[PDB]
Structure 1
Amino acid sequence: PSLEDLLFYTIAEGQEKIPVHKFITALKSTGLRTSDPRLKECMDMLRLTLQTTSDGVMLDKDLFKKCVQSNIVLLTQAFRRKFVIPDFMSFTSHIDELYESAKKQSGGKVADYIPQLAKFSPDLWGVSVCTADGQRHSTGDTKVPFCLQSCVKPLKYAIAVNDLGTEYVHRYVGKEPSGLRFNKLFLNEDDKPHNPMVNAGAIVVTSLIKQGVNNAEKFDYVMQFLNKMAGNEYVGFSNATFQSERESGDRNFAIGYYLKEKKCFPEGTDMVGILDFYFQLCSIEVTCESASVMAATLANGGFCPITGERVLSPEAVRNTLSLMHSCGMYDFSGQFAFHVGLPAKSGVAGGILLVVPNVMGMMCWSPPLDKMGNSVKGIHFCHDLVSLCNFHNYDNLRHFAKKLDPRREG
């Protein structure tokens, strides 16, 4: 027997040779993107034989064997329905409906405190999915760059725990939510910030990453890291947003000094310098698509799903998801944890980084925020998604009532 050969008969349909487009659309219908890095050898060989023989465009058992041999393990799982969402075409149909249902929630106010997010239109709205297996789907304004802002706080924490361990990082920052009107305090009772998703704890976590090196190499260190998470999709940097964040951050300058007085930073910290590195990290740019790969990396126990690369330790990813559950959505965290039950993180540009552990990661984006600071459409989408699918943290995988389960088939 032979794996390349048995896969050949599945797509051959008893016939003699497979047209290339018939193989291409069969492969794309699994949700894989024809530009998947795990598929580069297969696609390079296909492009070559489509030159070598204008005499086509048909592959026999032996010619198909030449192309798919290099990536046969991933292609077989994709064609024999072994992916975490087996019927991806029906699932994306559902994502499209949920998107259109949220597209009608036109309330909210765009963050206006800086001219660079006031520039963004309230009609933008996109959602990108990326499963723990690499299946992609987008709808809407998903290639528009926008800043992570507070969406970057869980990614920084993951990098800090990945490099320093849990016990070290949690000398300097706590692990609990604060309480629905302890939002205005910087420190909990141990004179540590309450947790990494809070501004005071985000700043302290920022002062742990790559100490001893200067602000240019730290920024390089974190961006190289964010590239691995996104399978080398778009990660950028807005100097416009950063220069404004620098000139309008009196609240954070207040935090920095209060943290200096109470000896919250590591010894030898340049507090004002850490504030620049902090403002920088909030001005990193993503699209919906590139961020949906980041979120899926946390969804996937730390391995980027479109490269197979190990990016974060299981200890760093578990801690980040734990803190996104309960501290992730500003004052909505408690209500969100109850009704949605997913690790999520919101931002002022309109991002919501959403992780369905063991299934997929997502990024929703609509600039207009409601009064607690979360994208109006994004929050609507997240409620709708969990009403439809048994992805809630404490839904049952066996007795889930009237919800659909995309991890099953019939």
Structure 2
Amino acid sequence: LYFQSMIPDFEEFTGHVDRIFEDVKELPDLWGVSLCTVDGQRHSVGHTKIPFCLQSCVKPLTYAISISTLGTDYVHKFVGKEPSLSLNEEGIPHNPMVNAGAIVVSSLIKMDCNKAEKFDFVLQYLNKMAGNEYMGFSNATFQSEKETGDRNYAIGYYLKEKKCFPKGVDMMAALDLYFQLCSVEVTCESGSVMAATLANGGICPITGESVLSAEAVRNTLSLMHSCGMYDFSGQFAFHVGLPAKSAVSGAILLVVPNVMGMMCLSPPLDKLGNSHRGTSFCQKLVSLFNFHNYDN
């Protein structure tokens, strides 16, 4: 019912999406948008079958998995809940959407097990969030972050120094898993289904599978709202007012709660590290359809 009021006519709605997508082209030239509604209707326009690495787009997914498997109380002994590297007053990374927090979050998953298993455990949730659609792995990107990710090594050693990891966790193992998860590949199409799972309270809308808890989803959407677009997060919360997560790949994972998930891809980044076209497209779509979280 709520969905029906927000999008009465799907074909008409996709027509407007296409028009905005087109306008935004007035900005390689990779440009794609896919969406998946909470009742499983789909639309892609442009370059939506090209694989690309999740990179930071994975941060809310791993956080949601940690909450789903361990609960809020425990997770947030190790990572904070608000916008900010550095550490906060309690001596922990500010939130799960900044690198230091995402690294700590990564360390929390299946602490009793090895590298291969941790990865496979996360991957099983990601597969289900995507309704078993396209999910790959870029060894090129993985090896590149391993060899050149000095910023993350610096953060890792700092977290270790400040005692920010759970007992018995090897810092280097946690970094290795974090780099692996950043190297998972999706397309706009599969990514949109993941975002739709978050839009749909943690149930994958193309399979009906329960993937994440309501608590995990609520927490994740809250932190995406406030921390999901790096230095542009405040502007985005004000003008667009929806949970989103950006990445250096030029991806934007956007959630419209109880309506749809979307994944946009356009590699060229603005000064704040967010897709120039993706961001502009979100603003135009939300203004036109009154999807802002505080639209009446």
Q: Could you tell me how far apart the structure 2 residues matched to 1:305 and 1:207 are?
A: 29
Is the 1:229–1:304 contact (alpha carbons within 8 Å) kept by the matching residues of 2?
A: yes
20, 29, 32: which one aligns with 1:98: 20
The one-character-per-residue Cα deviations of 1:298-343 (angstroms, maximum 9, x if unpaired) are: 0000100001110000000000000000000000000100000000
Is the 1:153–1:202 contact (alpha carbons within 8 Å) kept by the matching residues of 2?
A: yes
Q: Provide the TM-score with structure 1 as the length reference.
A: 0.71
Equivalent in the alignment of 1:134 = 40
The one-character-per-residue Cα deviations of 1:88-135 (angstroms, maximum 9, x if unpaired) are: 110000000010011111xxxxxxxxxxxxxxx1x0000001001001
331, 334, 354: which one aligns with 2:234: 334
Is the 1:83–1:133 contact (alpha carbons within 8 Å) kept by the matching residues of 2?
A: no
The one-character-per-residue Cα deviations of 1:52-90 (angstroms, maximum 9, x if unpaired) are: xxxxxxxxxxxxxxxxxxxxxxxxx9xxx9696331110
Distance 1:188 1:268, change over 3 A: same
Equivalent in the alignment of 2:253 = 353
3-state SS of the aligned residue for 2:90? Answer: coil
Give the superposition deviation at 1:186: 2.4
363, 369, 383: which one aligns with 2:263: 363
164, 169, 185: which one aligns with 2:70: 164
Equivalent in the alignment of 2:31 = 125
1:244 partnered with 2:144: yes
Equivalent in the alignment of 2:124 = 224
Q: Could you tell me how far apart the structure 2 residues matched to 1:142 and 1:83 are?
A: 27
1:270 partnered with 2:270: no
The one-character-per-residue Cα deviations of 1:255-289 (angstroms, maximum 9, x if unpaired) are: 01110111100000110111111111100000000
The aligned runs of 1:172-183 (5 Å cut-off) are: 172-178=78-84
Give the superposition deviation at 1:204: 0.3
3-state SS of the aligned residue for 1:171? Answer: coil
Q: Could you tell me how far apart the structure 2 residues matched to 1:163 and 1:232 are?
A: 20
- Return the structure number with greater relative CO, CA threshold 8 A, min gap 6: 2
Q: Could you tell me how far apart the structure 1 residues matched to 2:223 and 2:43 are?
A: 27
Count of residue pairs the alignment pairs up: 295
Equivalent in the alignment of 2:192 = 292
Q: Could you tell me how far apart the structure 1 residues matched to 2:176 and 2:212 are?
A: 25
Q: Could you tell me how far apart the structure 1 residues matched to 2:192 and 2:218 are?
A: 18
One-letter code aligned to 1:88: F
Measured on the aligned residues, the alpha-carbon RMSD in Å equals 1.3
Equivalent in the alignment of 1:304 = 204
Q: Could you tell me how far apart the structure 1 residues matched to 2:255 and 2:25 are?
A: 21
3-state SS of the aligned residue for 1:130? Answer: strand
224, 234, 239: which one aligns with 2:134: 234
3-state SS of the aligned residue for 1:368? Answer: coil
3-state SS of the aligned residue for 2:264? Answer: strand
214, 221, 226: which one aligns with 2:114: 214
Larger radius of gyration: 1
- Between the aligned residues of both structures, percent identity stands at 77
One-letter code aligned to 1:191: G
The one-character-per-residue Cα deviations of 1:338-395 (angstroms, maximum 9, x if unpaired) are: 0000000000011000000010000000001011000010011011011101100000
The one-character-per-residue Cα deviations of 1:196-244 (angstroms, maximum 9, x if unpaired) are: 0000000000000111110101111111110100111001110011001
Is the 1:144–1:287 contact (alpha carbons within 8 Å) kept by the matching residues of 2?
A: yes
Distance 1:84 1:387, change over 3 A: closer
Is the 1:84–1:133 contact (alpha carbons within 8 Å) kept by the matching residues of 2?
A: no
Q: Could you tell me how far apart the structure 1 residues matched to 2:92 and 2:146 are?
A: 25
Equivalent in the alignment of 1:53 = none
Structure 2 alignment gaps of length 5 or more: none
3-state SS of the aligned residue for 2:144? Answer: helix
Equivalent in the alignment of 1:58 = none
3-state SS of the aligned residue for 1:138? Answer: strand
